C-alpha cells in the first residue's frame, strides 16, 4: 500500500445455499429489486 508484497489465496465464495424445506412445496428466491 504505497512496503512488502503480500501473498493471498484465491477463494470464490459461492452465494449462500438455499436449503430446501421439508414442507409440502419448496422455497424460491424471487427478486424484489433489480438493475440492468
Amino acid at each position: 500500500t504505497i512496503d512488502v508484497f503480500q501473498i493471498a489465496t484465491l477463494n470464490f465464495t459461492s452465494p449462500l445455499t438455499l436449503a430446501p424445506i421439508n414442507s409440502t412445496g419448496f422455497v424460491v428466491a424471487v427478486p424484489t429489486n433489480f438493475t440492468f
Partner: protein, 48 residues
C-alpha cells in the same frame, strides 16, 4: 501475452462460482438417486 490470455479465459470460466446459487446435496443418496460417485468424500481424519 499467451499466458495472460489463458489466465484471463480461465478466470472468466471459473467466475461462474461467485454468481451461482446452489443447494446442499445430501451425502450419498439424494432421494433415490445415488450421487456418491460425483461427490467429494468427506473424511475427518485428514484434510478435505
Amino acid at each position: 501475452g499467451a499466458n495472460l490470455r489463458q489466465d484471463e479465459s480461465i478466470a472468466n470460466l471459473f467466475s461462474s462460482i461467485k454468481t451461482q446459487n446452489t443447494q446442499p446435496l445430501q451425502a450419498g443418496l439424494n432421494g433415490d438417486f445415488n450421487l456418491t460417485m460425483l461427490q467429494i468424500p468427506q473424511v475427518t481424519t485428514g484434510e478435505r
